[PDB]
Design a protein around this ligand. Sequence first.
Ligand code: 6HO
Ligand code: CL
Ligand code: CL
Ligand code: MG
Length: 371
Amino acid sequence: KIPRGNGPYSVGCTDLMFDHTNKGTFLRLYYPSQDNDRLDTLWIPNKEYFWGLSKFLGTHWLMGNILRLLFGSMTTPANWNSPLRPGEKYPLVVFSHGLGAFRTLYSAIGIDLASHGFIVAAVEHRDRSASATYYFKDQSAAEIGDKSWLYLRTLKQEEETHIRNEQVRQRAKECSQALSLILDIDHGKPVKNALDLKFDMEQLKDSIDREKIAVIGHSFGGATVIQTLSEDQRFRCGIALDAWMFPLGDEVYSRIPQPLFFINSEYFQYPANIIKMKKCYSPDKERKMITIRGSVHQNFADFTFATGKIIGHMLKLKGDIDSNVAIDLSNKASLAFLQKHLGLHKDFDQWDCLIEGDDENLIPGTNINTT
Ligand SMILES: O=C(c1cccc(F)c1)N1CC=CC1
Ligand SMILES: [Cl-]
Ligand SMILES: [Cl-]
Ligand SMILES: [Mg+2]
């Protein structure tokens, strides 16, 4: 089971695609909900995501059918299409997924943030970094629900530097576009969701605390945080969860005026990656870094909750640390950082000491030695 949120608000979930094209926005929204008696949200909602996962894992696409048998009915504890909780403006997080992932795979994070009074927009990237994604070729195809699928691109070693950089820039543009979509919905701009879902987007009018915007992401999504900050000042701070720094251009490092928090796993990180994080530092800039003891790269994603301990440790989905323990530290330290740099009037400063890595399961800074 994916954990329920720790905060006082019930959580709703819906999907939004606007426009319907491969250049439109596609996001999964998590939000404080009025009601708590809706059906739970289906975790991986289409067979083609399992096909995509199988391709990303380097197996026959019939392994996709096996993944679908094992995981196709799994839900996540968010109330599907629940009405938005009225009478309060919510801060906004835009969330960026890792390589081989897609919008639905970081619900443990999105649900927890929503349970504390955030609206969370988990973008699905169309840069061919997702295992799978879909869109509609035109207006007619969207009407009848005729989906065109786009699968993960495999690169030759010669393509690595250039294509990863083109992708992180598209990813940043996609984060900015998702922000502008939500801000126009907050105004009251009519938007026809290309998905025919029973969630009226009119509810989101006057619901966003328009100054209180952050960008969060894991791995490739962590590089997306940094690219997005350097290009879009509407984002006030960023949290990079075990960032994979390789995609970033040389130019970005000196160009991030916003506060930036690095939350790392113990076992993923390596000197070339840490050196790149340290290039983001300057005396005039707010930077924090903590490492979760006993954690692996996939501790930030929902697949850490999808299996048992033995199989989990084997497939590097789990580390030596308990998965609920690790995600609680990452989510609580995130909340304290967001309260500080968004200026929230909540009680998230109870976790200020986790920003400094002051906990038995935290390392301040990094365990990685560089030069
Ligand atoms: O690490 C995994 C993963 C998921 C299931 C089984 C597995 F062996 C590995 N991910 C899939 C998408 C992104 C990362
Ligand atoms: Cl790892
Ligand atoms: Cl290295
Ligand atoms: Mg911009």
